[PDB]
Amino acid sequence: QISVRGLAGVENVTELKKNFNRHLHFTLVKDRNVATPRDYYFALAHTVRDHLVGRWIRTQQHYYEKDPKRIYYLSLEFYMGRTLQNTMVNLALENACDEATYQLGLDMEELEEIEEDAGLGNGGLGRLAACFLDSMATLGLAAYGYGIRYEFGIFNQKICGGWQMEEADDWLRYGNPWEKARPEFTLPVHFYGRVEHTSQGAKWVDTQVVLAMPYDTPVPGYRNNVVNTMRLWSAKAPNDFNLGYIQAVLDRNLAENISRVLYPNDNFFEGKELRLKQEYFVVAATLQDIIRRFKSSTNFDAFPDKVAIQLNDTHPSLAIPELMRVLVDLERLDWDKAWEVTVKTCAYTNHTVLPEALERWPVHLLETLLPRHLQIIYEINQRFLNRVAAAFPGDVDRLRRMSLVEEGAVKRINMAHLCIAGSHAVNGVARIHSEILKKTIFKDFYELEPHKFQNKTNGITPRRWLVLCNPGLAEIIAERIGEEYISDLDQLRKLLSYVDDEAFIRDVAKVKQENKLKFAAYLEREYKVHINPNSLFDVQVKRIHEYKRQLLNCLHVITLYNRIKKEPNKFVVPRTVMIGGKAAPGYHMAKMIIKLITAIGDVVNHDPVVGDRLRVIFLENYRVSLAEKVIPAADLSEQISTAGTEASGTGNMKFMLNGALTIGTMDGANVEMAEEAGEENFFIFGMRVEDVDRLDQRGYNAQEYYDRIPELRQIIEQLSSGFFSPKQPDLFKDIVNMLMHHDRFKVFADYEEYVKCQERVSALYKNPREWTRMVIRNIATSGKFSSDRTIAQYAREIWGVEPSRQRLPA
Amino acid sequence: QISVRGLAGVENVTELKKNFNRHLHFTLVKDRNVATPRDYYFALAHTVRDHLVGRWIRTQQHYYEKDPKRIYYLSLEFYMGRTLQNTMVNLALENACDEATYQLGLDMEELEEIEEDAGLGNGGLGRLAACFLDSMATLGLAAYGYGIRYEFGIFNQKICGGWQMEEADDWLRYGNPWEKARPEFTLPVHFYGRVEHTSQGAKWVDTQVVLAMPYDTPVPGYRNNVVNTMRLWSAKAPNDFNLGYIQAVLDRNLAENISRVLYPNDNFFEGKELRLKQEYFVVAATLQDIIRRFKSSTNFDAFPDKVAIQLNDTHPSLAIPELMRVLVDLERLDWDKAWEVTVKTCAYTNHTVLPEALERWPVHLLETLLPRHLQIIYEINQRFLNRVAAAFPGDVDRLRRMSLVEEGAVKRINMAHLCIAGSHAVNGVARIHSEILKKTIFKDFYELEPHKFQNKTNGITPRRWLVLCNPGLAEIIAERIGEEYISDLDQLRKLLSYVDDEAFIRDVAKVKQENKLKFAAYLEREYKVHINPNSLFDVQVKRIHEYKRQLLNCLHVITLYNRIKKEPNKFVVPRTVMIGGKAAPGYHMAKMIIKLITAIGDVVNHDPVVGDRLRVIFLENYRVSLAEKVIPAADLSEQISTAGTEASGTGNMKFMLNGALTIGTMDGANVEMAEEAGEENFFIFGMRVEDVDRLDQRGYNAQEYYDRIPELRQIIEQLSSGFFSPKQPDLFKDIVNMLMHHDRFKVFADYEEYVKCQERVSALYKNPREWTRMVIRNIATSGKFSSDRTIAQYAREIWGVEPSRQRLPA
Ligand SMILES: N[C@@H]1[C@@H](O)[C@H](O)[C@@H](CO)O[C@H]1c1nc(-c2ccc3ccccc3c2)c[nH]1
Numbered sequence A, B: 001q002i003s004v005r006g007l008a009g010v011e012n013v014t015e016l017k018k019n020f021n022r023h024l025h026f027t028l029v030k031d032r033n034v035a036t037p038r039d040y041y042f043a044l045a046h047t048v049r050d051h052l053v054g055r056w057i058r059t060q061q062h063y064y065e066k067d068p069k070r071i072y073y074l075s076l077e078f079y080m081g082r083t084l085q086n087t088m089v090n091l092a093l094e095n096a097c098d099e100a101t102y103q104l105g106l107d108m109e110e111l112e113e114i115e116e117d118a119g120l121g122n123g124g125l126g127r128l129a130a131c132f133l134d135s136m137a138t139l140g141l142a143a144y145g146y147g148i149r150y151e152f153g154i155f156n157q158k159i160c161g162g163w164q165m166e167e168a169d170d171w172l173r174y175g176n177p178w179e180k181a182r183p184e185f186t187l188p189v190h191f192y193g194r195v196e197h198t199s200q201g202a203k204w205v206d207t208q209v210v211l212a213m214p215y216d217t218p219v220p221g222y223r224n225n226v227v228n229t230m231r232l233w234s235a236k237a238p239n240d241f242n243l244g245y246i247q248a249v250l251d252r253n254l255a256e257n258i259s260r261v262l263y264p265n266d267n268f269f270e271g272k273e274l275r276l277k278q279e280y281f282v283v284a285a286t287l288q289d290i291i292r293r294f295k296s297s298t299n300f301d302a303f304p305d306k307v308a309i310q311l312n313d314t315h316p317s318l319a320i321p322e323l324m325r326v327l328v329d330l331e332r333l334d335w336d337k338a339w340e341v342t343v344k345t346c347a348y349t350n351h352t353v354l355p356e357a358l359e360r361w362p363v364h365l366l367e368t369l370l371p372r373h374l375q376i377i378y379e380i381n382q383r384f385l386n387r388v389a390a391a392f393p394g395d396v397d398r399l400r401r402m403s404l405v406e407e408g409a410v411k412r413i414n415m416a417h418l419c420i421a422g423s424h425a426v427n428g429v430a431r432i433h434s435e436i437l438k439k440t441i442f443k444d445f446y447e448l449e450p451h452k453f454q455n456k457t458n459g460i461t462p463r464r465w466l467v468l469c470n471p472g473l474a475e476i477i478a479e480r481i482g483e484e485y486i487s488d489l490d491q492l493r494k495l496l497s498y499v500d501d502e503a504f505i506r507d508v509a510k511v512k513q514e515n516k517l518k519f520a521a522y523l524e525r526e527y528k529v530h531i532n533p534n535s536l537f538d539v540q541v542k543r544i545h546e547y548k549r550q551l552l553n554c555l556h557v558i559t560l561y562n563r564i565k566k567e568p569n570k571f572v573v574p575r576t577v578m579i580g581g582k583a584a585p586g587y588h589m590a591k592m593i594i595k596l597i598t599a600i601g602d603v604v605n606h607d608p609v610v611g612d613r614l615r616v617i618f619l620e621n622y623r624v625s626l627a628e629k630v631i632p633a634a635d636l637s638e639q640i641s642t643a644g645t646e647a648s649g650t651g652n653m654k655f656m657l658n659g660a661l662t663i664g665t666m667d668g669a670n671v672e673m674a675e676e677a678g679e680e681n682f683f684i685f686g687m688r689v690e691d692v693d694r695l696d697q698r699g700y701n702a703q704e705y706y707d708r709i710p711e712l713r714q715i716i717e718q719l720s721s722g723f724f725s726p727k728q729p730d731l732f733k734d735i736v737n738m739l740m741h742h743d744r745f746k747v748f749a750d751y752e753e754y755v756k757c758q759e760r761v762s763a764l765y766k767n768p769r770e771w772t773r774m775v776i777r778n779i780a781t782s783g784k785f786s787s788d789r790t791i792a793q794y795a796r797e798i799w800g801v802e803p804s805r806q807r808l809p810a
C-alpha cells in the first residue's frame, strides 16, 4: 500500500501464508473452525519470529569471531511495549505480512491490537532504555541490555468513580513468543551470610543462594540484519531450598519473589529490602555473565578494552563494589589494579535532581544483606576521601559533603556519590540538566575531577515513534526526500525547502486530520466517549507528578470554562483537553490530581452552555501502545514542568516528530528543542531556572498571586467551596492547602504567563495555513532528537567504539 | 533393527532428519556447534510431537461429530513417567527415529535418558491412572483424564549417610514439550463465602475466586491414530486479587499454592486444608468443563447417557455434592431428579482397606471452606438414612454405622460412604479385595444395595511394560506368534506350545541375561556400585510401608548372612538383593526401614568371607523410569504384604510380564496371578486372610515366635545390641520394639514359611532350564493382567460403552 512499509513480492507472500498455516496447525494446535483472533495473532507472531532466528544466530556468531568491545547496558527497567509491528518494520516485512494476512481473510491491524505491552518500566527512564537498544542495534554495536524479567509489570490503571484503581499486569498469561528461556545458563546469586578474614583474603560465607535464570529477547536493527540480545533474569529457588516438607516447598516463593513485580514509583525512591534484593540480583548475575564471556576469548588489564558497563542511574550501582569483590576476593588482584579496571569499565548516567528520587540506602540493610559489599564501600570511601583531603587540604566541610557515607540518626550510603567515584564518565541527559549537575548537586565532584562530567542529550527512536506509529506522515516525507531519513534523522532539515509548498502544507494537515479522526473513533469504540475532531487536541500525557504540573493545566482548563460561562455567546477556538498518566499507588497527592481532572470533566462535559467548545477527557491506562495512538493525533504538546525539575523529558520529542506544536517552560530538553526549531516556532512561557532561584531566595508566597489575580482567586474559591464536588464539598481541601501554603513547584507563579501563552496558541490555530507552516518548521528540525544521535555520542565519547551503518549478510 | 519397533523407510527418515534440523534452528535457536545433548533431546521431542498434532485435532473433531458417550476419569494423581519413547511406540516411529538420529551422529537411547519423569503420583494408584489412559485410547473410547498440574511432583530421593533426604522435583524447569496451555478455557473456582436462602433457592455468596487454567497433554492409542486428552488444571489468581500494592501482588501466591505440590503420602490420609482445596479445585473446574461440553451438542435426563464420571478413590468425591449443587442451585432441577442424574453418572473405585488411608474430613473444615457442599452432604445423609430405616426398621446401630457423618469429639464426613450413596457402581481392584469390601468394611451397604458392588481386577499396559522397557523379550515373542499380542495380550497363551522348545528356552534366558548385564552396567556408571550379573536378582521395589513388609525381606537377608558366617565354605546360590522405594517424608518408621536396609548393606557388602555370594543394594530414587530398567532385569519378584492388606498391587504384574518368578503371599492380585499360572509355578507362602483373622481373635504375641525360633532370636539380638550400628548401638530400638510389641502386620508370623520358601527358590535357580520353563509358564499366562482387559470390563459393565479396535484414518 505505502512505500516505507516495503515490498510485497509474490514469493514472499506465498511463503508467509504457508508458514502462518503451519504455525496455526503445529504450534497452536487449532484449525480455522475454532481459531480466535488471539490464535491468529500468535500464528503471525511465530511466523515473523522465524525471520529473526537466522540473523540472531549469525549476529552472535559474528561477535564471537570478530571479538569487538562489548557494551552492557544495565537497567532495572526496559519499557518495550509491543514487538510485532516493530519487528516487521525493522525487517521490511510489514507490506508482505499485510498482504499475506489480507489474502487469508484477516485484518493485520486488528491482530496487532491483541498483543500485550511489555510494560517493564514506569515511564521515561525505562522507555529511554528501550529506544537505546533499538539505536544500538541499528548502529551495529555489540550491545546487550540486562535487566529483570518481572512477572508483573507496571499496573493496569482503571478509573472507578473518577479514582485510580490498580490491577496486576499479568502480561505473561497467554505466553510471550518473543523470549527464549535459557535455563542452561542459570547462575547463582548470594545473599546474607557473613565475612571471614583468612590468611589469603576475605571470604563471604554462609550465604543464601537464589538462582538467576536468563530469558533472551531479540533486538533487531533497522534493515541491517543485526539482531542484538536483551537478557532478563528471573529468580528461581534451588531444589534443596529449605530442605515440614509441604511448607518447605511452598516457601520457595520467598526466593522467587525477587523477580515478581516492578516497583511502580516514577522518580521517587522507596528504600525497601525487596528493591535492594532486585538491584543486587540483576548486578550479580549480569557481572558473572560478563566475566564468563570475557574469559572465553588471567589478564584483566584488557578488561576495559573489551567491556563497557553503562549504569542507568544508580539503580545498578552495586556493579561497582561487585566488580571489586570479584576482582579482589575471587581473582586475587591487588586493590589498586582492580580499582583502575573498575573505573575504566564503568560509566554512570544521572537522570534526576529531585532529592526524593536519589537512592540513599540505610547502612543496616546493606550490613545484613550484603556485608562484604558494605566493607568494600567503606574502603572505597576512605581512599576517595584521602584524595579529596590531598586536593583541598583543611576543607573539612567538603569531606563531609563528598562522603559516600551520610551521617544522621540513620547512616546511609549515597549511591550517586559511589557511582561518581567509581566511573570514568558521568553524564546528564540534557544540556541544562548536565549544567545543573556541575553547578549544584555534584559541584564538589566536578571541582575534583572536571574531566569526568559530560552531557548526552536524550533522544527517541524514529522507527517506533514515526514510522511505526505515524505511517501517513512517514510516507509524505519519504515522497519528497526518500527513505534515508529513517536512520539519519538530520535529513529532515531538507523539509525546510517545502515550507511554502502548497501541496506539502495540504498533505501535512491532511495526515494530522486523518490521525485525529482515527483517534476520535478509537475513543468512541473502546470508551463510549464522543469528541469533536475539528477541535484543537491539547494533550498532556506523562506520569502524574506535582513537578510535571498537571495542576497548572487544570487551572487553565477551569479558566477557559469560567470565561465561557461569563461570555457564552463569544467565539472561542474549540478544544479537547486530554490528560493521561499513572499515579504511583502510594502517592496520595497524585491520586487526588487524577480525581480533580475527572471531576472537572464531570462539570465541563455536561454543561449545555459550553456545548462542544470544551471537552476534558482523562485518558485511562496511559502506556506505550496508547502513546503510539494519541501522539500522532495531538495538536498541542503540554511540557510544563517547573524550570529545573524535568531532567530531560522524552515525550516532548515524540510530539515534535509527529506534528504537534509545544507549549512549554525552558526546562530539560525543551531548551534544545526551542533552539533547534527557533524560539519563534515554540510557545515558551514562564520562569527560567534563574527566576525560580530568585523567588526561592526571597521566599515563595502563593497568597500574593491569589490576592493580585481575580481569575485565580475565583478558581480557588470554586475548589474550596465544593463547586467540582457538590456531594463532598471539602474533597479538594488538600489540593487547595498545598497550592496556598507548601507548593514546591510554584504553580501560581507561572499561571498568568501560561494563560496568556495559551491565548497565542488559540490565535495561531485559527489560521490553519500558518499553524501548519510552524509545524513543518518543528518536524524539519527534530533530527537532533533521534536516539541514533545520542547513541553515537555515547559510543564515541564514553565507550570508545565506532558506530557502523553497514549491513551483515542476510 | 528389531521388527516390533516398525519400519524405517527412506522417505520417513529423510523427513524426520529435516524436521529435527528445522526444530534445532527455529524452535531451539541453536546451531550444531553449541548444541548440547539436552538441545538434541528437545529437537527430537518436537519432531515426534508434530506427528501427534493432526491425529489429535482429527480425534477431537470426530468426537464432536459422532457425539459418543464421554468417559471422565477424575484423579488427583497421574504417574505418567517419560513420554518420548511411548509416543514413538504408539505411532510406529521408533525404528525411523533411531535411524534418523543415527545418521545425524546421535544415540537416541542417550537422548531418551535426558527426559524428566512426569511424577505426578505417589505409586500404584497414580500409575494405574496412567495405564488406564493408555488403554482407553487404545480401545477407541472417548475418554478424558482430569487432574492437577502440580508444579512439584513426587520428591527426588537422595540417600545421605544411609538416610532418605528429599529434594523438590522441579520437573518443569527446562519446559514440558508435551503440554499445550489453553488459557482461553480458564474457569473460576469458588471458596469460603456463606449461604443465603432466598425465595428461589440457596445462593453461595461472598466467595474468594481462584482461576483454573487447563494444560492439555495428548494420549496416543496403540497404532490406531486415536489421540485422547489429559487435561490438568493449574491455579491462577485473578488480576484484581487483593486489589499496600507490592504486598497484594506478592500475596497472589496464597491462591496459586493450590497447584504447587503433590502430597507425598502413599496409602495414608492427612486431613490438611490445602489438600481439601486441591480436591475441590479439580472437581469444580472439571465439572464446569463437562457441563459446557454436554450443552454444546435444558434436558439433563440425557446427561447420564452422554457422561460417565469415574472417581479414582474418594479423592474427587466432592464431584457428587458439586454435581448436585450445580443441578439444584444453578440449573433449578428438583432434588429427586438431580439425584437420579448424579447417581447414574457417577461410579466409585475403592483402592484400599487400611483405615489410616480412608478420607474422613472434619466438619469444621468443610463448614468454613465449602459451606453449601456441607449442607448438601447433610441432606444426602438424611435421605439416605431414611432409606436404611425403611429397609431395616429398628436397627439403630446400622443407622450409626452407615451414616455419612461420624460422631466423636470431632465430627467427620466419611467420604467412602458418600461415594457409595452417590454412585451406581462401586468396585474393588482385585477379586479378594472386592470380596473383603462386601464382607467387612462395606457389608452394611452391600446388604442394602447388592447390585452396586463389582470387581474390576487391575492391569498394566503392555505397551510401556513390555514393548517399551523390554524390546528383546517383545521381539522373541513376536518371532513366534506375531505382533497382535501387543493389543490382545491373551494371545501370550500361545507360548505354552514352546515350553519344551529348546531354541525358545535359550532365547528367553538370553534376553534376561542381556537385561541383567545392561542393568549391572547402569549401576556402575550412575552409582559406582559393582554387582555379579550371574547372581539371582532378588528385587523388592515399591513404596516403603510397614504393610508391604520390606522388614520381612530384611530378616531373610540377615538370615542368609548369618548362615554364610556359620558355614562359610558351603555353597550357596549367589544373590543380589535389591530393595528400593520412597518413604513419605513424615513417616518415621518407613525412614528407619530405609536406614536399616543401608546399614545391612554396609555390613554384608564389605565382609570378605561373604565375597560376591550376597550383596544388598538400596536402589535410590525409585520412580517409573527406574522401574523400566530394573523390572526387565529381575529374576525374583518380592510381593510379600500381609494377607488382606495390599488391595491389588500392580508391580507384581509388571514383573510377571517381564520374566521374573514371584515369591508372594495370597494377597491382592497375587491370588489371581497364581490361579492363572498354576500354583505349582508360583512361590506361595504364609498366612492366608483366614489365618490372619484366626491370629487376631486369639491375639498376636510376637514373643512366642522369638522364643521358638533360634535364628529369629539371633537376628533380634543383633539389631538390639548394635551389630548393624556400632557407633549408635540403640539406633534400631524403635524397630525392635515395634516388631516385639505392636506389629500390626505380623512379620514374625510369616518368617519361618518365608525362609523355607526362599530355599525352594534357590534350589530351582540351580537348574536354569527348569527355572526358564517356569518363567515361560508365567509369561504365557500373564494376559489377564493387561489394562486393556480391565478397561473393556469398566466400559461394558460400568460405563455402558463398547470398546473398538478400529483405526481412525491417518
Ligand atoms: N516455549 C516457550 C514458552 O514457555 C513461552 O511462551 C516463552 C518462554 O517463556 O517462549 C516459548 C518458546 N519460545 C521459543 C522461541 C523460539 C524462537 C525464538 C526466536 C526469537 C525470539 C524468541 C524465540 C523463542 C522456544 N520456546
Ligand SMILES: N[C@@H]1[C@@H](O)[C@H](O)[C@@H](CO)O[C@H]1c1nc(-c2ccc3ccccc3c2)c[nH]1
Pocket: A122, A124, A125, A128, A265, A266, A267, A268, A269, A270, A313, A351, A352, A357, A358, A429, A458, A646, A647, A648, A649, A650, A668
Ligand atoms: N524524570 C526523568 C526524565 O526527565 C527523563 O527524560 C528520563 C530519561 O532520562 O528519566 C526520568 C527519570 N526517571 C527516574 C526514576 C525512575 C524510576 C525510579 C525508581 C526508583 C527510584 C528512583 C527512580 C527514578 C529518574 N529520572
Ligand SMILES: N[C@@H]1[C@@H](O)[C@H](O)[C@@H](CO)O[C@H]1c1nc(-c2ccc3ccccc3c2)c[nH]1
Pocket: A026, A027, A028, A029, A175, B049, B050, B052, B053, B174, B175, B176, B177, B178, B179, B180, B181, B217, B218
Ligand atoms: N510454549 C510452551 C511453553 O511455555 C512450555 O514448554 C509448554 C507449556 O507450558 O509448552 C510450550 C508449547 N507447546 C506447544 C505445543 C504445540 C504442539 C503440541 C502438540 C502435542 C502436545 C503438546 C504440544 C504443545 C505450544 N507451546
Ligand SMILES: N[C@@H]1[C@@H](O)[C@H](O)[C@@H](CO)O[C@H]1c1nc(-c2ccc3ccccc3c2)c[nH]1
Pocket: B122, B124, B125, B128, B265, B266, B267, B268, B269, B270, B313, B351, B352, B357, B358, B429, B458, B646, B647, B648, B649, B650, B668
Ligand atoms: N495400595 C493400593 C494398591 O494395592 C493398588 O494396586 C493401587 C491401584 O489400585 O492403589 C494403591 C492405593 N493407593 C492409595 C492411596 C494413594 C494416595 C493417597 C493420598 C491421600 C490419601 C489416601 C491415598 C491413598 C490407596 N490405594
Ligand SMILES: *Cc1c(COP(=O)(O)O)cnc(C)c1O
Pocket: A122, A123, A124, A127, A541, A542, A543, A622, A623, A624, A627, A648, A649, A650, A651, A652, A654
Ligand atoms: C515517552 C513516554 C514517557 C515519558 O514522557 P515524559 O513526558 O518525558 O515524562 C512516559 N510514559 C510512556 C508510556 C512513554 O511512551
Ligand SMILES: *Cc1c(COP(=O)(O)O)cnc(C)c1O
Pocket: B122, B123, B124, B127, B541, B542, B543, B622, B623, B624, B627, B648, B649, B650, B651, B652, B654
Ligand atoms: C507399578 C509401580 C508402583 C506400584 O508397585 P506395587 O508393588 O504394586 O506397590 C509404584 N511405583 C512405581 C514407580 C511403579 O511403576
